[PDB]
Design an enzyme around this catalytic site. Sequence first.
Site, PDB file in Angstrom:
ATOM      1  N   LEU A  17       0.912  -1.276   0.443  1.00 25.64           N
ATOM      2  CA  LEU A  17       0.107   0.143   0.319  1.00 25.64           C
ATOM      3  C   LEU A  17       0.892   1.377  -0.234  1.00 25.64           C
ATOM      4  O   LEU A  17       0.623   2.567  -1.108  1.00 25.64           O
ATOM      5  CB  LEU A  17      -1.026  -0.473   1.047  1.00 25.64           C
ATOM      6  CG  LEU A  17      -2.053   0.385   1.409  1.00 25.64           C
ATOM      7  CD1 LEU A  17      -1.927   2.614   1.955  1.00 25.64           C
ATOM      8  CD2 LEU A  17      -2.805   0.893   0.366  1.00 25.64           C
ATOM      9  N   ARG A  19       4.943   2.864   2.295  1.00 24.74           N
ATOM     10  CA  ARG A  19       5.838   2.821   2.930  1.00 24.74           C
ATOM     11  C   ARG A  19       6.018   4.039   3.029  1.00 24.74           C
ATOM     12  O   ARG A  19       6.092   5.687   3.054  1.00 24.74           O
ATOM     13  CB  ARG A  19       7.210   3.341   1.614  1.00 24.74           C
ATOM     14  CG  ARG A  19       8.275   3.407   2.737  1.00 24.74           C
ATOM     15  CD  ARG A  19       8.558   2.545   3.855  1.00 24.74           C
ATOM     16  NE  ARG A  19       9.775   2.825   4.182  1.00 24.74           N
ATOM     17  CZ  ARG A  19      10.816   3.339   5.285  1.00 24.74           C
ATOM     18  NH1 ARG A  19       9.757   4.460   5.136  1.00 24.74           N
ATOM     19  NH2 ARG A  19      11.855   3.871   5.013  1.00 24.74           N
ATOM     20  N   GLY A  20       5.590   3.839   4.682  1.00 29.76           N
ATOM     21  CA  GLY A  20       5.166   4.847   5.595  1.00 29.76           C
ATOM     22  C   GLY A  20       6.798   5.210   6.205  1.00 29.76           C
ATOM     23  O   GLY A  20       7.399   5.115   6.254  1.00 29.76           O
ATOM     24  N   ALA A  21       6.540   7.494   7.184  1.00 37.48           N
ATOM     25  CA  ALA A  21       8.284   7.799   7.963  1.00 37.48           C
ATOM     26  C   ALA A  21       8.679   6.499   9.308  1.00 37.48           C
ATOM     27  O   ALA A  21       9.825   6.073   9.380  1.00 37.48           O
ATOM     28  CB  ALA A  21       7.831   9.414   7.854  1.00 37.48           C
ATOM     29  N   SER A  22       7.319   6.258  10.135  1.00 36.92           N
ATOM     30  CA  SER A  22       7.481   5.473  10.953  1.00 36.92           C
ATOM     31  C   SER A  22       6.694   3.571  10.791  1.00 36.92           C
ATOM     32  O   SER A  22       7.457   3.191  11.684  1.00 36.92           O
ATOM     33  CB  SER A  22       6.106   5.618  11.943  1.00 36.92           C
ATOM     34  OG  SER A  22       4.808   5.590  11.151  1.00 36.92           O
ATOM     35  N   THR A  24       6.294   1.085   6.931  1.00 36.73           N
ATOM     36  CA  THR A  24       5.622   0.685   5.754  1.00 36.73           C
ATOM     37  C   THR A  24       3.900   0.259   5.634  1.00 36.73           C
ATOM     38  O   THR A  24       3.935  -0.257   7.348  1.00 36.73           O
ATOM     39  CB  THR A  24       6.137  -0.222   4.812  1.00 36.73           C
ATOM     40  OG1 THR A  24       5.954  -0.617   3.809  1.00 36.73           O
ATOM     41  CG2 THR A  24       6.077  -1.647   5.368  1.00 36.73           C
ATOM     42  N   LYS A  40       1.437  -2.446   9.959  1.00 34.63           N
ATOM     43  CA  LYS A  40       2.471  -1.429   9.813  1.00 34.63           C
ATOM     44  C   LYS A  40       3.527  -1.910  10.251  1.00 34.63           C
ATOM     45  O   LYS A  40       3.849  -2.543  11.068  1.00 34.63           O
ATOM     46  CB  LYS A  40       2.010   0.320  10.904  1.00 34.63           C
ATOM     47  CG  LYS A  40       2.948   0.809  10.394  1.00 34.63           C
ATOM     48  CD  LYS A  40       1.952   2.404  10.376  1.00 34.63           C
ATOM     49  CE  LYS A  40       3.061   3.507   9.908  1.00 34.63           C
ATOM     50  NZ  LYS A  40       2.364   4.749   9.712  1.00 34.63           N
ATOM     51  N   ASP A 130       3.637  16.066  12.113  1.00 28.15           N
ATOM     52  CA  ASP A 130       4.012  15.415  11.147  1.00 28.15           C
ATOM     53  C   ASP A 130       2.684  14.729   9.965  1.00 28.15           C
ATOM     54  O   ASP A 130       2.569  14.025   9.787  1.00 28.15           O
ATOM     55  CB  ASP A 130       3.891  13.978  11.443  1.00 28.15           C
ATOM     56  CG  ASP A 130       3.496  13.347  12.928  1.00 28.15           C
ATOM     57  OD1 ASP A 130       2.354  13.858  13.108  1.00 28.15           O
ATOM     58  OD2 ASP A 130       3.876  12.712  13.524  1.00 28.15           O
TER      59      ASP A 130
END
Lengths: 246, 284, 76
Positions: A17, A19-22, A24, A40, A130
Amino acid sequence: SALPTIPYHKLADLRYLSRGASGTVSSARHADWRVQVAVKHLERKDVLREAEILHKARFSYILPILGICNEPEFLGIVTEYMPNGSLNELLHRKTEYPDVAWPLRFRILHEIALGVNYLHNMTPPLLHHDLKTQNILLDNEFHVKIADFGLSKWRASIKHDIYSYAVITWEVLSRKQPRPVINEESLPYDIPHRARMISLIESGWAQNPDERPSFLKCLIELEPVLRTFEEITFLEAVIQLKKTKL
Amino acid sequence: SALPTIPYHKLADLRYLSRGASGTVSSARHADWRVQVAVKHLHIHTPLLDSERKDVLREAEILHKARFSYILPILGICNEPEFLGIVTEYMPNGSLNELLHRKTEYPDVAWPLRFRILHEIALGVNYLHNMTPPLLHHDLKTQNILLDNEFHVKIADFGLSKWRMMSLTIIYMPPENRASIKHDIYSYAVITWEVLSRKQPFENPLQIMYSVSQGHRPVINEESLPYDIPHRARMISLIESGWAQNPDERPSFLKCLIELEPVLRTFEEITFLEAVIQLKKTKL
Amino acid sequence: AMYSEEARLKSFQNWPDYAHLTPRELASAGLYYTGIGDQVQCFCCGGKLKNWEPCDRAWSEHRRHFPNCFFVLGRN
Ligand SMILES: [Zn+2]
């Protein structure tokens, strides 16, 4: 603490879906529930603290946490899904997205303002740091949810969040990647109550923190604008958008 | 693992909605947060007995412990010395109780959404039994299930829900009356039939005790069960398995979800968005 | 007359119901209401305060923003 724990074997349809900073976000269908949860993962302590934070603040405008995946081979956090994705897909991509209506963006702004208002109205309060248009999450009907609490620090206060709200306001009324200029080409005069929005955006990103708007004042001055519209356009602009998608 | 409390001075505009078993439903606008927030309360400014205090305390604790995106979240409580009330989020469109029992307001409701909200409630109840030890809601009905602006449906009123232990309306009882997990399946079947049919079961309630327990079910008639709706026989089978006389053969919620999935494969989200307009304008 | 607490209390008329601080708390903090919106100010500095913080108390924010208060100096 006190959150459900589920095994990783209860997940299927592992699909990428974002790739988050904290960490994926994986679009993985469950097994017992069989729904494409937002697992996550990749930091283990960081995501445990993230789960703690999402369990701490629980509002309809924040995606509700559903559990944790405590397994030696893989640690995960389970939340709801996003079929239409974030605001980045809605605004930054205009090649096939033809148009986005004013009521939709104004409703998005109102929802973000309310969410960060509560986020600043807790005991003790919280700060985001954020808040970005990519971080804003649209549900099946484009309602706003807020995720990626990695830069959210337990507690400069009430400044970065309101500045982020102002810049995202100008972004979704301008649909242009980012001080930003507020001319007519970027902000055409057809927008209802335009001068109000111009005053709002200059107030929001003011250099001096003393005059920096509070979210409460933001929502109490913005409420007449959303009062002007009605539910008909709110429920019809999404239909027009989806029809234009095909 | 902490549930923040709400002082009474912050909340404002108490508006009457209804009176439930575990409290008196009311709506309000939370002034500090600028959010419309509904509430429920057994009593207003009366000596708070410890029994109902413990009841509401454990209610808040269980709601906070296990929260799902398909159930109504909990905001907080007011620990006032004289008034007790649960503060929970307000979904603007409300519940299905008047939606399913107001022909003048809702003469017609499209079957795509009628079956999609069934998928949501099935997902919620299936999750509700996934957390060990499994939770038995005991009071899952059309009132408890409630919808937000876009008709996304959430359930609430966990007050009389009793956690399952292994240390071995009165017309809503299953033939079981020992707590049995299949009561949730039975409630899901009856609400599934109530969604499409828009008919209230038991329409003297004394005979229901000897009827539903022995095997009698609400009448099956062509006017309330027309063949025009596709997958009619499938949902007939689903409910008839749902409210069986005993827990041995009633399908697990996974099986009901699997059975219903091909039914819901016959729709698109554009159809749902088109169908919300007709319902949102016929209720005007 | 502004020194008297009753003057601040009567200046706190038509106070909106969404405010997080009761007129009495502001009066103890030494602030008054102009009449327009939620604007308040102290008799020592005259500094006008807005953008209410729901969790912050009037005394704390007056001390933080304006530690030069004679009222706070006497309080401390
Ligand atoms: Zn001063």
